Amino acid sequence: GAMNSSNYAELFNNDIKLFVDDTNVYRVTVHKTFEGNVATKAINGCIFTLNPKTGHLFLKIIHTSVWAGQKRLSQLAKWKTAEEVSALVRSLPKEEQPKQIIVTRKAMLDPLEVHMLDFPNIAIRPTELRLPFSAAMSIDKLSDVVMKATEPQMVLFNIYDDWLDRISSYTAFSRLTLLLRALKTNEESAKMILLSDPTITIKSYHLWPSFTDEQWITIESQMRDLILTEYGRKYNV
């Protein structure tokens, strides 16, 4: 059924699974018109489809041309997401297809179920976890590829860089969600923490800096402090 803290270790077992987050599919800026009305302007978006065991990220870039002349875009965006996830599954060899797809927002359940009727053995599940995947566009290299796109595109990434050489996928996912939660809560301070030290760089083929094990502990502590600091500012604690 739903995925929560009780069955959290299930994310790191050997059954292939994908998280699908649609938050950044339909993105707009809101502005006044010359006549003083309000209008939206869409900007490029993305589907965030992640294997939490391996770190494989299938980033489908959603180019603004897909909205041209369409109505009810917030609704269409859910169905476009489901169409694209279904297309990805069909493109994968049988032995790489997921056994479960976990949607971060319950409004994706029916669109994905309907698009996946041909795969009755793939379970479509919601989650009770609040996952910060909306903050993926705070990762500079992901935001860059999305904004530069001139046509629909799929780009593949490993969102854990090389961490799985040293840590388990449970720990890697915990690190990722902490980083993304910090970027969601205070992006500027989070990026300051990650880049403050010029001697630690991001390899051409990576998304995050090349921290040693001890430095990752420092970084993780600084991210937890950021989150707690912002909680205190928010609630006057």
């Binding site: 269409l76 169905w79 489901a82 029916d110 669109p111 179920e113 309907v114 698009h115 009727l117 041909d118």
Partner: protein, 300 residues
């Protein structure tokens, strides 16, 4: 006018005939029901006084044979049987009528209720939903499951309604997922009407039969089917105008006849609220909306 005689009434029972009902005492001199209007299907139904478990009954049409009821003390119920000897049957009925041992079907002349509830219901179509080919009448009870209920268990004793499932490959064309899920017109008009039912009369017949089995037997599966067939129409953007006007009339008379005290167990709040206030046809069912709002405003 036709007659269904009873051999006897050895157990106390509430007997229904269509929308009417009356109580018979244990071993009372009751020998059946006369003056049954020719031209419609009918249902004769039972609820035992000493055990309200299992409502059960029989759908029949007096034009198809001479039918009577006899209690079976082994199986513990009133059974319908056909009498093939016509002169024997007429002689039995005449004797019981002469001794005034029959109740008269209590139809008011102004009253079109039964016609309005069975307009599209035909015995031949009943016998395909309820499969027991050696009898001309059809047994239904409170516990019988539907074919769809069984897929989700004795198949011989099942209600073979047409399966409706909005998240099924039958309902959704590959490549038209959003279109077909948000607008059920394909599934209604091409799959169901043109493909399975052949015409709207057969579809309305099954819808009306499902409602009546839900109401008279408390059949849960019958209730799910009746709601499903309403929702499929209401959730379609493209419905022939004649079907929408007929549906409004069908539902109006169903809601009018429903016992007020069973409204909680016969009307589903999610399905009615959707059909009346959110669906494509939210403004096409004026008579049904008006009776629903005046009779069951709580459900809404």
């Amino acid at each position: 006018m036709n007659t269904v005689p009873f051999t006897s009434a050895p157990i106390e029972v509430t007997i229904g005939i269509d929308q009417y009902s009356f109580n018979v005492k244990e071993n009372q001199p009751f020998h059946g029901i006369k003056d049954i209007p020719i031209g419609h299907v009918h249902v004769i139904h039972f609820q035992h006084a000493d055990n309200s478990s299992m409502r059960y009954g029989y759908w029949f049409d007096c034009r198809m044979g001479n039918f009577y009821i006899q209690y079976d003390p082994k199986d513990g119920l009133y059974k319908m049987m056909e009498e093939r000897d016509g002169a024997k049957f007429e002689n039995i009925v005449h004797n019981f009528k002469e001794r005034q041992m029959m109740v008269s079907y209590p139809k008011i002349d102004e009253d079109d209720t039964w016609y309005n509830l069975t307009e599209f219901v035909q015995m031949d179509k009943i016998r395909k939903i309820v499969r027991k080919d050696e009898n001309q009448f059809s047994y239904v009870d409170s516990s019988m499951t539907t074919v769809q209920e069984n897929e989700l268990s004795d198949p011989a004793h099942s209600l073979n309604y047409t399966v409706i499932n909005f998240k099924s490959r039958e309902a959704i064309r590959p490549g038209h997922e959003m279109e077909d899920f948000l607008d059920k017109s394909y599934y209604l008009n091409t799959v169901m009407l043109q493909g399975i039912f052949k015409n709207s009369s057969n579809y309305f017949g099954e819808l009306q039969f499902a409602f009546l089995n839900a109401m008279f037997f408390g059949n849960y599966g019958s209730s799910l089917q009746w709601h499903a067939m309403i929702e499929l129409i209401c959730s379609s953007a493209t419905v022939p105008k004649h079907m929408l006007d007929k549906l409004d009339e069908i539902l109006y008379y169903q809601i009018k006849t429903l016992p007020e005290q069973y409204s909680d167990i016969l009307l589903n709040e999610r399905v009615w609220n959707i059909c009346l206030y959110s669906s494509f046809q939210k403004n096409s069912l004026h008579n049904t909306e008006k009776i629903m709002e005046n009779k069951y405003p709580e459900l809404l």
